[PDB]
Design a binder for this molecule. Structure first.
Ligand code: NA
Ligand code: NA
Ligand code: NA
Ligand code: NA
Length: 340
């Protein structure tokens, strides 16, 4: 209902949109629900308007997103580089969805940077770069999928958002707010959800497809990791870990530890959570916080990593007990910050 996106930006893109024959949509490395949801949401709309549209991402997306209509036609850059490169170089318009810095598309950077096609960014992350000619940057909005819905609506094409398109948009809104459990207080979110439901989507089924679709081994693994968790009561923090012996034992598949780092936050007075995993070769670190404790600051100092305020990661080249000791240093240094 409220006009968040600048009308001038909407006017400009509409010009590009009407002139364009060939359009490419790009999103970030290791794309997730909102990367794929926003991209596929835009794809379905654009494809309904007699346009050649291809979605290209650097990297495979999780299997729990395969159900999404159009997902099979998403082009993986690390498997069809030459083909993708041609599409990118020849695109009249390149839509950059759910990232704001060329490093977020890891190896696609150069071809995207070089292409003479007209670039527009549609994103909700903080601190955007100026590689796009049109920049729609709204970090106050909780997902890129919502911005895509908003853009299409403001252009006057709400009626051309299909059931399939709506499914993809809802999926991204859902995943980026943890099923509307964080950063979701805004009223207009729920009007948008209602609008998407009017397109025939089944939001409950979509929840199940994304979150209630994984192996017996994965869930037993989650339980084992939780059984062996370490809580530091004076530091409002929790630690969980997986070794190579533990991973191999439970038959670890890629993406099995996804979300594990969040579970310890469901303990009362635990606002900061760390997960340590040995790689296939040393210690991978995942950090999560609830509230305002800066995950990205600790990661940058103690694990040469980074990311966002509430979710970060990085590697530590050493051993488990050695990596655990480093984690215990950071807890000690930022102890006063945690107590606030
Ligand atoms: Na808007
Ligand atoms: Na941004
Ligand atoms: Na997401
Ligand atoms: Na909020």
């Amino acid at each position: 209902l409220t006009k968040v996106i600048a009308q001038a930006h909407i006017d400009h893109f509409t010009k590009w949109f009407e002139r364009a024959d060939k359009i490419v949509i790009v999103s970030h490395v290791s794309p997730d629900g909102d990367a794929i949801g926003s991209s596929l949401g835009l794809y379905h709309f654009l494809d309904s308007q007699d346009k050649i549209v291809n979605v290209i991402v650097p990297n495979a997306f999780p299997d729990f997103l395969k159900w999404m209509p159009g997902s099979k036609d998403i082009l993986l850059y690390d498997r069809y580089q030459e083909f993708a490169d041609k599409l990118i170089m020849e695109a009249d318009v390149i839509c950059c969805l759910d990232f704001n810095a060329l490093k977020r598309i890891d190896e696609m950077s150069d071809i995207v940077a070089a292409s003479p096609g007209r670039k527009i960014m549609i994103d909700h992350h903080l601190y955007p770069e100026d590689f796009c000619r049109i920049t729609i940057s709204h970090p106050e909005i909780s997902s890129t999928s919502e911005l895509v819905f908003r853009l299409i609506c403001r252009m006057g094409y709400f009626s051309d958002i299909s059931k399939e398109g709506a499914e993809c948009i809802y999926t991204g809104m859902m995943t980026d707010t943890g099923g509307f459990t964080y950063n979701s207080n805004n009223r207009e979110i729920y009007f948008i959800i209602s609008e998407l439901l009017s397109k025939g989507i089944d939001k409950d089924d979509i929840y199940r497809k994304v979150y209630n679709t994984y192996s017996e081994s994965r869930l037993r693994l989650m339980g084992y990791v939780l059984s062996n968790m370490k809580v530091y009561k004076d530091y409002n923090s929790a630690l969980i870990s997986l070794t190579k012996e533990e991973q191999g034992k439970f038959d670890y598949i890629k993406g099995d530890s996804e979300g594990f780092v969040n579970i310890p936050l469901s303990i009362k007075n635990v606002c900061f959570s760390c997960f340590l995993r040995e790689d296939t070769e040393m210690i991978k670190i995942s950090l999560r916080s609830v509230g305002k404790f800066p995950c990205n600051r600790l990661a940058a100092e103690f694990f040469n990593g980074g990311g966002h305020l509430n979710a970060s990661g990085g590697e530590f080249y050493g051993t488990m007990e050695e990596a655990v000791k480093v984690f215990e240093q950071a807890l000690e240094k930022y102890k006063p910050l945690l107590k606030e």
